[PDB]
Amino acid sequence: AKVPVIEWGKCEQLKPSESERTSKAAVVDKCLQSLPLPDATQQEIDKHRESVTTCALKAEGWFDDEGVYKFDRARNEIKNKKLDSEVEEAVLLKHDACQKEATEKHDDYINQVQLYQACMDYNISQICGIKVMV
Ligand SMILES: [Ca+2]
Ligand SMILES: [Ca+2]
Ligand code: NA
């Protein structure tokens, strides 16, 4: 269980804050109590990962009363990071583009956030030059 080295490229401002790191450690710790990790197939690991992720989003208030992911919360959290204005523009464009694809391809609110997050993970890493080394 090696600690990753992250190169944040042009997006160092996206680094999580101390409150976010402390929260995420405790929220995921609690989710794993009731959704323990297997230690088998890729399919089983992924399902367990996705279940822990939904549990973590709900614990942090990421679904509104209708159960829809809070896309507008995500958008505002990007702006609150205070990226360089040109980089902020590019990151907000990908938020809007990924949201539109997710909500067109899926009616299911969980499938929507999985597609949105997959789309943001790929596109934000490319624009920012983010590299994770384990
Ligand atoms: Ca760097
Ligand atoms: Ca379309
Ligand atoms: Na569903």
Numbering used by the authors: 11 to 49, 53 to 147
Sentences from the paper on this structure:
In this work, we have explored the structure and function of such non-insect OBPs in the mite Varroa destructor, a major pest of honey bee. Mass spectrometric analysis demonstrated that the six cysteines VdesOBPs, whose sequence position do not match the pattern in insect OBPs, are paired into three disulphide bridges (C1–C6, C2–C3 and C4–C5) different from that (C1–C3, C2–C5, C4–C6) of their insect counterparts. The overall folding, determined for VdesOBP1, is also novel and different from the conserved structure of insect OBPs, although some similar aspects can be recognised. Comparison with classical OBPs reveals that the second of the six α-helices found in them is lacking in VdesOBP1.
The three-dimensional structure of VdesOBP1 was solved by sulphur single-wavelength anomalous dispersion (SSAD) with a wavelength λ = 1.512 Å on beamline proxima 2A at SOLEIL synchrotron (Saint-Aubin, France). VdesOBP1 crystal forms P3221 and P21 were crystallized at pH values of 7.5 and 9.5, respectively. They contain one and two molecules in the asymmetric unit, respectively. The chain was built in the electron density map of the P21 crystal form with the exception of residues 1–6 at the N-terminus, while the P3221 crystal form starts at residue 11 and lacks loop 50–53. The r.m.s.d. value between the structures of the two VdesOBP1 crystal forms is 1.55 Å. A crystallographic dimer can be reconstituted in the P3221 form, using a symmetrical molecule in the crystal packing. Finally, the PISA server reported an ambiguous response for the P21 form (score = 0.49) but discarded the possibility of a biological dimer in form P3221 (score = 0). All in all, it seems highly probable that the biologically relevant form is a monomer.
